[PDB]
Design a protein around this motif. Structure first.
Motif, PDB file in Angstrom:
ATOM      1  N   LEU A  59      27.946 -39.896  72.061  1.00  0.00           N
ATOM      2  CA  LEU A  59      28.775 -40.289  70.832  1.00  0.00           C
ATOM      3  C   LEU A  59      28.568 -39.131  69.814  1.00  0.00           C
ATOM      4  N   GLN A  60      29.705 -38.882  69.116  1.00  0.00           N
ATOM      5  CA  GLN A  60      29.796 -37.995  67.957  1.00  0.00           C
ATOM      6  C   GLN A  60      30.631 -38.525  67.143  1.00  0.00           C
ATOM      7  N   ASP A  61      30.482 -38.148  65.743  1.00  0.00           N
ATOM      8  CA  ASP A  61      31.519 -38.675  64.333  1.00  0.00           C
ATOM      9  C   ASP A  61      31.345 -37.383  63.574  1.00  0.00           C
ATOM     10  N   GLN A  62      32.061 -37.584  62.452  1.00  0.00           N
ATOM     11  CA  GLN A  62      31.979 -36.373  61.455  1.00  0.00           C
ATOM     12  C   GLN A  62      31.517 -36.938  60.056  1.00  0.00           C
ATOM     13  N   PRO A  63      30.224 -36.956  60.059  1.00  0.00           N
ATOM     14  CA  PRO A  63      29.603 -37.573  58.759  1.00  0.00           C
ATOM     15  C   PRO A  63      30.321 -37.055  57.518  1.00  0.00           C
ATOM     16  N   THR A  64      30.219 -38.001  56.475  1.00  0.00           N
ATOM     17  CA  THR A  64      30.688 -37.724  55.216  1.00  0.00           C
ATOM     18  C   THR A  64      29.631 -37.933  53.987  1.00  0.00           C
ATOM     19  N   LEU A  65      29.997 -37.372  53.045  1.00  0.00           N
ATOM     20  CA  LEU A  65      29.020 -37.538  51.699  1.00  0.00           C
ATOM     21  C   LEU A  65      29.989 -37.617  50.604  1.00  0.00           C
ATOM     22  N   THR A  66      29.778 -38.508  49.636  1.00  0.00           N
ATOM     23  CA  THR A  66      30.517 -38.677  48.368  1.00  0.00           C
ATOM     24  C   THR A  66      29.754 -38.266  47.228  1.00  0.00           C
ATOM     25  N   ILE A  67      30.000 -37.334  46.589  1.00  0.00           N
ATOM     26  CA  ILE A  67      29.219 -36.996  45.463  1.00  0.00           C
ATOM     27  C   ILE A  67      29.754 -37.313  44.086  1.00  0.00           C
ATOM     28  N   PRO A  68      29.228 -38.325  43.413  1.00  0.00           N
ATOM     29  CA  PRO A  68      29.835 -38.522  41.999  1.00  0.00           C
ATOM     30  C   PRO A  68      29.673 -37.606  40.820  1.00  0.00           C
ATOM     31  N   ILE A  89      17.635 -32.672  47.285  1.00  0.00           N
ATOM     32  CA  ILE A  89      18.913 -32.810  47.315  1.00  0.00           C
ATOM     33  C   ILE A  89      19.067 -33.662  48.619  1.00  0.00           C
ATOM     34  N   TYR A  90      18.214 -33.339  49.792  1.00  0.00           N
ATOM     35  CA  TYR A  90      18.638 -33.761  51.176  1.00  0.00           C
ATOM     36  C   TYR A  90      17.896 -35.373  51.163  1.00  0.00           C
ATOM     37  N   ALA A  91      16.881 -35.404  50.268  1.00  0.00           N
ATOM     38  CA  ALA A  91      16.457 -36.904  50.019  1.00  0.00           C
ATOM     39  C   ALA A  91      17.606 -38.024  49.764  1.00  0.00           C
ATOM     40  N   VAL A  92      18.373 -37.365  48.805  1.00  0.00           N
ATOM     41  CA  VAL A  92      19.345 -38.116  48.262  1.00  0.00           C
ATOM     42  C   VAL A  92      20.384 -38.389  49.134  1.00  0.00           C
ATOM     43  N   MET A  93      20.844 -37.306  50.065  1.00  0.00           N
ATOM     44  CA  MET A  93      21.680 -37.054  51.069  1.00  0.00           C
ATOM     45  C   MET A  93      21.374 -38.244  52.134  1.00  0.00           C
ATOM     46  N   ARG A  94      20.059 -38.072  52.660  1.00  0.00           N
ATOM     47  CA  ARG A  94      19.554 -39.139  53.484  1.00  0.00           C
ATOM     48  C   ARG A  94      20.160 -40.644  53.251  1.00  0.00           C
TER      49      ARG A  94
END
Ligand SMILES: Cc1cc2c(cc1C)N(C[C@H](O)[C@H](O)[C@H](O)COP(=O)(O)OP(=O)(O)OC[C@H]1O[C@@H](n3cnc4c(N)ncnc43)[C@H](O)[C@@H]1O)c1[nH]c(=O)[nH]c(=O)c1N2
Ligand SMILES: *[C@@H]1O[C@H](CO)[C@@H](O[C@@H]2O[C@H](CO)[C@@H](O)[C@H](O)[C@H]2NC(C)=O)[C@H](O)[C@H]1NC(C)=O
Ligand SMILES: *[C@@H]1O[C@H](CO)[C@@H](O)[C@H](O)[C@H]1NC(C)=O
Ligand SMILES: *[C@@H]1O[C@H](CO)[C@@H](O)[C@H](O)[C@H]1NC(C)=O
Ligand SMILES: *[C@@H]1O[C@H](CO)[C@@H](O)[C@H](O)[C@H]1NC(C)=O
Ligand SMILES: *[C@@H]1O[C@H](CO)[C@@H](O)[C@H](O)[C@H]1NC(C)=O
Ligand SMILES: *[C@@H]1O[C@H](CO)[C@@H](O)[C@H](O)[C@H]1NC(C)=O
Ligand SMILES: O=[N+]([O-])c1ccc(O)c(O)c1
Ligand SMILES: O=[N+]([O-])c1ccc(O)c(O)c1
Ligand SMILES: [Cl-]
Ligand SMILES: [Mg+2]
Ligand SMILES: [Mg+2]
Ligand code: NA
Length: 585
Positions: free
Chosen positions: A303-312, A505-510
């Motif tokens: 299974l795959q998808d294409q993750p998203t990130l919303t930056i405010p 950065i990545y701690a928030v992304m996770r």
């Protein structure tokens, strides 16, 4: 009986049903879980976009080990037209090497060159007005866009002024204008093609362009609001299906096909029909007492998808109007809606919360100073580390083959790995197109009404975070470029300019990444059986006759792009394959 029965009336299923019923001697029954849409404004009008009207109910992920054990709601369509009915209308082909790579995995007849005629056949592009093309920097290559096919696509007829600031900022940080993102490469910024019919500025979904268009045909049968619960066999020949009402009434009905059964039930639906039918990993089927028809460990794997990130963001000087004006300025919203209702102009031609341009980048374009370091880490790590111990060795071999193809893509300046977008309001979007992580979707029971277990496994492969962090940093470059600084942006908590290290950065992304953009694929993959594949190059399920997978379950891996355009074109191609085998008109 029918000539063909198709399980799922989404993009792939309706495209195939349309083309097969061009022969009046061929009857098709499409069995679709959801209802017909009612032509609601939240479906037809881009600015009114309401995708939740037809989300499949009751799907939740497992806790996501790579995302702080978060559980997420799982989003997929349940409606005639499938994802085309409720998607954001973004209509983009993959890059050449996506299709070439699928061919190189052991699939004769698969390449950019072989797909191009089917991309063209699938669609009718309507050019924007010349003043909008000039003002907006809208370009295209008419030679490679279809003129005669059923899927209408075009562009909105308006852009928000801040889209100009963002375009120029992107150019300032190494994302140049792309002549045509449909030409097999898309390195830089371009207008988003939209699956809109420009004569009405309404959605051109598969319900319309591959059912309504041809619904005078008595040989094209549809049964909405029913689930295919099982495939029926005579020995190894698929001869029919069982179906039930979606709403769960204790009724079951058998229907039979003279030629083939086609699965078109999507990344999260096709594997479930196969596993309930005894086509799947013998370990799972034995645990549940399901007799094994074809022992295929790949079913539900990959299974795959294409993750998203919303930056405010907050802004000291954002320009008016912008997408958020629609939600915070009742006067502006009313005037733009009145404008649309009268002359079909303005902000309501753009999908709500989206802007008109976007950027795509290769790994070297994202990370020119470090992409070789990411490639080395990925090369060093055994493919098997991305999958649980005891994963079937054929599934591991196919994953390794995909991984090697994706690492060549990481080296390729002309293949995308991520997207940047700004809607013109309070948030930016960064998408990860090419994850190395792989998930699962497995039935939990023999009850066809029970949701399967859905484990995205987002971020379980540690290379993904390295790629995603690079994409985040490129987004930050755009917002810091001169053309955007005039609007006075700053990242808002939980992001912020004070997060400067990869770790910070990545701690928030996770905590914020969503596993999915509803691009679920690849759970019945087209690879050799000894590589953990489920279907042949002709999309035939191994070990049985008269059974194919048409929906994007068959894809080996994700595109440099979003799935819809290829979902249409792949079903156009499969229709011809089936017609040739069965000597149809
Ligand atoms: C909200 C949202 C937003 C986006 C997207 C999706 C969604 C849901 N996508 C993704 C894209 O729309 C999607 O990948 C394709 O529709 C996949 O086409 P398929 O034919 O594989 O499945 P699709 O999901 O279209 O159809 C499968 C159908 O099978 C039915 N079904 C499932 N199980 C069944 C069973 N047992 N029996 C009968 N029927 C069954 C479902 O109800 C569904 O209608 C997207 N892509 C893109 O390129 N641009 C975009 O802007 C977006 N945005
Ligand atoms: C959506 O695409 C179709 C298919 O090309 C267009 O349909 C044609 O429309 C013209 C003008 O109405 C007719 O003359 C042709 O006969 C139609 N062709 C087919 C095969 O249907 C339709 O025009 C497109 N929408 C827009 C805005 O261009
Ligand atoms: C997630 O849960 C597992 C137990 O299932 C635990 O071992 C792990 O430490 C948890 N991860 C995080 C980030 O809390
Ligand atoms: C179009 O591109 C030109 C040249 O870079 C630029 O000056 C202009 O601002 C751009 N406009 C938009 C709307 O992107
Ligand atoms: C469904 O109907 C059959 C036949 O009457 C019955 O044996 C079974 O108990 C019913 N199942 C449910 C879930 O009600
Ligand atoms: C609200 O929108 C109207 C209509 O376009 C505009 O005239 C007005 O200045 C806007 N109000 C604010 C506070 O931006
Ligand atoms: C870092 O900036 C964020 C975002 O504005 C804010 O939440 C936080 O207070 C800042 N951190 C410190 C230590 O000032
Ligand atoms: O996959 N998801 O989580 C999604 C994808 C698209 C959506 O519009 C949505 O509301 C959720
Ligand atoms: O521009 N691209 O390639 C895109 C745009 C949107 C998407 O959701 C995507 O997965 C890829
Ligand atoms: Cl209905
Ligand atoms: Mg014109
Ligand atoms: Mg120009
Ligand atoms: Na116009």
């Amino acid at each position: 009986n029918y000539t063909f029965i198709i399980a799922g009336g989404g993009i792939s299923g309706l495209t195939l049903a349309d083309r097969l019923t061009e022969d009046p001697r061929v009857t098709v029954l499409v069995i679709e879980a959801g209802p017909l849409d009612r032509g609601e404004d939240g479906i037809l009008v881009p600015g009114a976009f309401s995708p939740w009207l037809y989300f499949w109910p009751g799907l939740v992920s497992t806790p996501q080990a790579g995302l702080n054990n978060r559980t997420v709601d799982v989003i997929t369509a349940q409606v005639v037209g499938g994802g085309s009915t409720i998607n954001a209308m973004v209509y983009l082909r993959g890059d050449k090497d996506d299709y070439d790579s699928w061919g190189a995995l052991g699939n004769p007849g698969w390449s950019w060159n072989s797909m191009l005629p089917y991309f063209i056949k699938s669609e009718t592009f309507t050019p924007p007005s010349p003043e909008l093309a000039a003002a907006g920097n809208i370009t295209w290559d008419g030679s490679i866009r279809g003129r005669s096919g059923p899927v209408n696509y075009s562009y909105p007829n308006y852009f928000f002024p801040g889209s100009e600031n963002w375009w120029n900022a992107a150019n300032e940080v190494g994302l140049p204008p792309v002549k045509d993102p449909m030409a097999g490469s898309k390195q830089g910024v371009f207008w988003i093609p939209s699956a809109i019919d420009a004569r009405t500025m309404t959605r051109s979904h598969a319900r319309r362009n591959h059912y309504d268009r041809v619904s005078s045909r008595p040989n094209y049968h549809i049964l909405p609001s029913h689930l295919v619960s099982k495939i029926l066999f005579r020995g190894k020949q698929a001869i029919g299906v069982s179906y039930i009402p979606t709403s769960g009434g204790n009724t079951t009905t058998n229907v039979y096909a003279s030629k083939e059964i086609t699965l078109a039930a999507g990344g999260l639906g096709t594997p479930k029909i196969l596993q309930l039918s005894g086509i799947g990993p013998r370990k799972l089927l034995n645990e549940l007492g399901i007799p094994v028809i074809s022992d295929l460990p790949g079913v539900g794997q990959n299974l795959q998808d294409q993750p998203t990130l919303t930056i405010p963001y907050t802004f000291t000087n954002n320009v008016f109007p912008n997408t958020d004006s629609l939600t915070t300025n009742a006067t502006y919203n009313a005037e733009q809606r009145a404008l649309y209702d009268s002359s079909k102009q303005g902000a309501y031609t753009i999908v709500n919360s989206l802007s008109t341009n976007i950027g795509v980048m290769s790994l070297q374009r994202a990370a020119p100073k470090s992409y070789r370091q990411i490639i080395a880490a990925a090369r060093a790590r055994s493919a098997s580390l991305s999958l649980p111990p005891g994963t079937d060795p054929a599934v591991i071999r196919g994953y390794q083959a995909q991984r090697n193809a994706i690492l060549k893509q990481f080296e390729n300046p002309n293949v995308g790995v991520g997207t940047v977008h700004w809607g013109t309001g309070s948030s930016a979007l960064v998408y990860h197109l090419k994850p190395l992580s792989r998930g699962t979707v497995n039935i939990r029971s023999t009850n066809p009404l029970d949701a399967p277990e859905i484990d995205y496994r987002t971020g379980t492969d540690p290379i993904d975070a390295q790629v995603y962090t690079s994409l985040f940093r490129k987004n930050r470059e755009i917002f810091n470029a001169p053309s955007m600084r005039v609007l006075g942006p700053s990242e808002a908590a939980p992001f912020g300019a004070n997060l400067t290290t990869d770790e910070e950065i990545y701690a928030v992304m996770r905590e914020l990444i969503n596993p999915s953009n509803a691009h679920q694929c690849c759970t019945a993959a087209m690879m050799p059986k000894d590589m953990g594949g489920v279907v042949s190059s002709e999309q035939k399920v191994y070990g049985v006759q008269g059974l194919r997978v048409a929906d994007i379950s068959f894809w080996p891996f994700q595109l440099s792009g979003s799935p819809m355009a290829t979902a249409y074109a792949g079903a156009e191609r499969l229709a011809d394959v089936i017609k040739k085998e069965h000597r149809l008109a």
